[PDB]
Amino acid sequence: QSPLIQTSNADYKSGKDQEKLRTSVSINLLKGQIQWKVTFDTSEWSFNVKHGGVYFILPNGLDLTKIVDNNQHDITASFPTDINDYRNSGQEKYRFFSSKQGLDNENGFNSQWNWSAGQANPSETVNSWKSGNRLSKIYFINQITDTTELTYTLTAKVTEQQSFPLLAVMKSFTYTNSKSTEVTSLGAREITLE
């Protein structure tokens, strides 16, 4: 695995929180299968006042088989498999987005990229992945109200390949930076299969 990438659109408007905000997302490889754990330092995000949301972003060649939340609850079956299932509406807590199923409109893969990682001032590398069409699934959880470190654990089967980008994104649905965009942070790592 590569070294950790972290970016955010957090700017001067957030005082001595700007850098804690930038570094809140981290990803660590754990183990024909890939397993990794995502940690969100929600400390300075004020989620308990007005909630946030998180995003898990998966590449081509990986298929989520298991996802466990910070309460060690297996929430895999909570996510839609059809993006147009009525259980996938904007109100719902667990949402799923897929490039195969659509790119544009509110539940479209590109729209959700734009509203998640796109907003986290992604470096050139993260943008290569999106632009090089190397990513295909987004898993989303609304209503994050925690104020501590949340850890999720994800397992996925390698369906195809050597390069495996893993991304995660957290943001506020209310607090914005100085250009009026939701404060949004990202962490990513490249896993290479030798």
Ligand SMILES: OC[C@H]1O[C@H](O[C@@H]2[C@H](O)[C@@H](O)[C@H](O)O[C@@H]2CO)[C@H](O)[C@@H](O)[C@H]1O
């Ligand atoms: O990304 C998950 C959310 O998608 C929709 O909101 C998006 C976007 O994230 C938000 O920042 C923007 O203000 O509006 C978009 C839709 O018009 C849902 O509204 C959210 O509840 C989440 O599902």
